[PDB]
Amino acid sequence: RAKVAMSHFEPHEYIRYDLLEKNIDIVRKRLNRPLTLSEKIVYGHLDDPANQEIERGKTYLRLRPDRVAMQDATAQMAMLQFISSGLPKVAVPSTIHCDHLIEAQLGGEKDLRRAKDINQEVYNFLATAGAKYGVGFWRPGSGIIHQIILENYAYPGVLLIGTDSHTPNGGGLGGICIGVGGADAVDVMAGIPWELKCPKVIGVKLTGSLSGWTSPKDVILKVAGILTVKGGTGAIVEYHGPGVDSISCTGMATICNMGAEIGATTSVFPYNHRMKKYLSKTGRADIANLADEFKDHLVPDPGCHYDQVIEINLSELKPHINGPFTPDLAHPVAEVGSVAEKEGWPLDIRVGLIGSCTNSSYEDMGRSAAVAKQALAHGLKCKSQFTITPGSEQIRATIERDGYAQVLRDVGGIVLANACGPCIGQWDRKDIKKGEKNTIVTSYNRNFTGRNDANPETHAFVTSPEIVTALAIAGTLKFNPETDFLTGKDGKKFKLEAPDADELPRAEFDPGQDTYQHPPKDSSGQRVAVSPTSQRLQLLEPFDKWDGKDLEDLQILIKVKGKCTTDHISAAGPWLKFRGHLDNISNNLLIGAINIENRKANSVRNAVTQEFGPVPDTARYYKQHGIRWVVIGDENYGEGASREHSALEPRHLGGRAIITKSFARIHETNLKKQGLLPLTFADPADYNKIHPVDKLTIQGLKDFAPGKPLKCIIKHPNGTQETILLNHTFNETQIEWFRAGSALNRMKELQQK
Ligand code: SF4
Ligand SMILES: [O]
Numbered sequence: 001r002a003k004v005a006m007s008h009f010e011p012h013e014y015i016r017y018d019l020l021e022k023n024i025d026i027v028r029k030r031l032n033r034p035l036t037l038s039e040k041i042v043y044g045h046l047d048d049p050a051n052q053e054i055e056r057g058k059t060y061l062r063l064r065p066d067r068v069a070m071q072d073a074t075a076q077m078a079m080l081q082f083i084s085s086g087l088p089k090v091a092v093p094s095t096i097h098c099d100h101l102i103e104a105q106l107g108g109e110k111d112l113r114r115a116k117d118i119n120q121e122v123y124n125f126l127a128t129a130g131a132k133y134g135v136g137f138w139r140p141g142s143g144i145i146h147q148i149i150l151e152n153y154a155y156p157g158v159l160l161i162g163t164d165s166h167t168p169n170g171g172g173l174g175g176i177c178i179g180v181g182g183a184d185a186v187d188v189m190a191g192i193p194w195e196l197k198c199p200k201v202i203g204v205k206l207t208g209s210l211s212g213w214t215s216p217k218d219v220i221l222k223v224a225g226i227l228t229v230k231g232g233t234g235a236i237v238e239y240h241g242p243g244v245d246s247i248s249c250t251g252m253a254t255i256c257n258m259g260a261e262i263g264a265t266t267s268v269f270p271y272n273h274r275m276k277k278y279l280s281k282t283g284r285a286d287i288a289n290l291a292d293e294f295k296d297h298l299v300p301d302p303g304c305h306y307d308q309v310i311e312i313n314l315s316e317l318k319p320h321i322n323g324p325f326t327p328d329l330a331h332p333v334a335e336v337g338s339v340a341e342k343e344g345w346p347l348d349i350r351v352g353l354i355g356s357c358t359n360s361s362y363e364d365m366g367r368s369a370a371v372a373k374q375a376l377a378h379g380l381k382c383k384s385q386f387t388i389t390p391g392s393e394q395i396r397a398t399i400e401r402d403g404y405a406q407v408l409r410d411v412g413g414i415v416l417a418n419a420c421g422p423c424i425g426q427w428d429r430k431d432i433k434k435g436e437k438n439t440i441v442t443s444y445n446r447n448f449t450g451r452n453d454a455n456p457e458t459h460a461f462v463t464s465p466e467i468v469t470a471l472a473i474a475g476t477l478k479f480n481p482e483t484d485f486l487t488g489k490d491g492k493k494f495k496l497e498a499p500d501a502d503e504l505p506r507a508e509f510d511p512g513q514d515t516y517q518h519p520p521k522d523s524s525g526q527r528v529a530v531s532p533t534s535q536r537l538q539l540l541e542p543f544d545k546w547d548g549k550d551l552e553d554l555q556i557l558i559k560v561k562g563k564c565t566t567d568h569i570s571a572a573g574p575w576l577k578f579r580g581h582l583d584n585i586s587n588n589l590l591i592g593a594i595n596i597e598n599r600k601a602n603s604v605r606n607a608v609t610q611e612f613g614p615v616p617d618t619a620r621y622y623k624q625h626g627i628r629w630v631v632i633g634d635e636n637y638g639e640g641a642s643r644e645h646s647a648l649e650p651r652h653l654g655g656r657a658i659i660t661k662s663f664a665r666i667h668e669t670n671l672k673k674q675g676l677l678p679l680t681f682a683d684p685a686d687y688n689k690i691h692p693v694d695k696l697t698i699q700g701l702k703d704f705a706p707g708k709p710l711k712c713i714i715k716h717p718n719g720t721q722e723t724i725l726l727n728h729t730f731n732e733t734q735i736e737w738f739r740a741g742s743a744l745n746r747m748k749e750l751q752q753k
Pocket of ligand 2: 164165166641
């Protein structure tokens with residue numbers, strides 16, 4: 001038995017490939033078929049491999065993740081619910097990463113120093129909560145959670161859960177990394193089996209090879225166009241084929257990462273020599289050697305069946321740019337000029353933003369600087385404003401030394417801190433007035449409405465960072481780097497050649513500024529105090545328990561039309577300063593959702609006063625008057641970010657049930673965790689039989705059972721009524737979260753009482 005540590009920070013915690021193999025063998029003895037790669041790693045992590053019922057797309061798997069990671073905008077509510085379980089330390093290796101509260105304003109350390117003084121209370125809280133419960137802490141400036149995870153923590157066959165959507169990024173290193181809400185991470189840190197609905201598996205076969213301007217990003221921008229934002233729901237995306245071996249480890253992380261934008265449970269690549277070179281370049285040669293020895297369990301079984309198969313010829317794939325308000329509106333960079341002209345999107349690119357998490361590696365920085373260096377050899381600088389986020393302090397230190405940062409700086413770039421920044425709206429913008437219509441190209445992944453700067457006329461197009469650079473040098477959406485014009489002030493030769501770059505540093509990486517903090521061995525006398533008067537941090541008052549009765553005469557707060565992401569339910573940006581305080585953050589509840597009645601964001605009819613106004617105020621009026629309510633939603637309600645606040649905030653403001661045509665995975669788990677009832681129309685046309693005025697009775701809660709539909713009476717103002725049926729995906733574990741008022745109350749009644 002090998003004793004290879006999980007990371008450089010937990011030398012006493014070994015990789016368990018013998019347990020994985022042990023459990024894969026038990027499960028294929030029961031299933032008697034080839035297993036996909038994701039099936040190998042997921043079923044190899046089952047708590048009961050001998051007795052787990054296993055069926056893709058319908059069974060709930062009780063899993064034992066190897067580690068947990070949180071970022072600081074979702075770590076706050078996850079550790080208040082861990083505090084509340086009153087466990088003295090966490091059960092598996094866990095980390096907090098301080099990357100979401102650093103606002104981009106001046107660049108680099110002006111901004112970082114600013115964020116340390118502005119978010120001192122929260123960073124203190126998380127640092128002393130981590131020292132006490134045994135959670136590793138990555139300080140402000142360390143880097144974006146996924147980038148530190150890929151560098152330090154992801155390895156082949158790991159099962160990692162993270163309180164973030166883009167945790168799937170770690171699949172570029174052959175692990176299964178799945179985003180969850182804080183209350184799931186609390187389960188695994190507390191020692192509870194993590195339950196996951198058995199994924200269906202999409203195979204993406206890659207043939208050929210990536211060439212010239214076409215980069216990793218374009219493979220997932222293509223797949224997202226192909227499959228749409230809803231197409232990966234309840235499935236893990238598995239890349240296979242001849243062309244996989246043409247992709248660097250960090251470009252495999254890029255493809256796995258944006259898979260979140262099709263709603264996939266996660267995405268993964270098979271262990272290969274590009275993962276082995278990346279493990280060795282990051283000081284984890286021993287993990288690559290161990291994985292080689294278990295490679296059979298870290299690739300798919302020959303002949304495994306994918307439920308859906310898509311083919312992408314890498315060699316004929318050419319550059320993409322997606323948007324403007326959904327990540328699945330895919331355009332080749334060549335036709336994006338002509339189609340923006342046609343559709344009424346600005347061709348002027350105000351700001352080009354490279355980096356942030358999907359695309360912030362040393363290869364992304366080398367390819368961006370290779371474009372920028374050419375512009376510079378012709379005495380050119382950017383016509384658009386340009387920002388660069390390094391993915392981690394290691395990448396910042398290594399590209400500084402290898403000179404990429406000075407080239408990016410010299411074409412007019414501002415290197416921002418190693419933090420999300422612009423990506424979740426931690427950006428103090430300035431170049432446009434409020435409501436100005438503008439374009440911005442970014443190498444991020446999401447381009448939801450007003451996500452970046454809190455302005456809706458902002459058309460955000462996502463693409464590769466080398467395309468963001470060249471298009472920032474050009475200033476317009478009608479420049480296609482592959483064919484077109486350059487001048488310089490020398491007057492000469494027009495064309496930007498294909499940005500060649502170094503995959504990894506040819507010397508060793510430079511680590512930089514010292515950013516990690518170990519939990520002390522004996523943490524006796526770590527008080528983690530939360531001020532009772534703090535406006536940033538507040539303890540969670542347990543939600544009420546279910547009174548045993550049905551839900552009669554529910555008022556509709558809002559019937560939502562169309563696309564309703566977690567950014568519509570609970571916006572980020574200025575709202576991240578309250579992510580530790582549920583009553584203050586509940587003031588953004590569904591302010592961005594579109595009301596079907598008037599098609600306005602944030603004005604719904606108050607049913608008592610008949611005055612239209614803000615959705616949070618109306619919810620608070622109903623709660624204070626004892627009027628219970630529901631949201632009626634359309635398709636894939638709760639798409640996007642994993643923030644469990646989307647679920648905590650309707651519960652806190654008096655909500656009882658959300659009834660939709662369908663839900664995104666993670667938000668539906670969170671609504672069940674907080675004691676709400678996520679329900680779906682058995683017939684989605686029934687959405688049209690429910691009008692804003694109608695009162696709803698959900699009946700037969702007293703017989704709430706797995707697989708049994710609930711009925712709903714739609715009581716029309718005029719005395720007619722009609723009964724429809726509502727489906728749910730609750731199992732008995734989850735029904736007992738409902739009955740107890742939340743999964744936290746259910747844990748608390750199990751701890752004696
Ligand atoms: S998507 Fe943006 S806010 Fe979410 S983790 Fe990545 S960089 Fe940070
Ligand atoms: O994210």
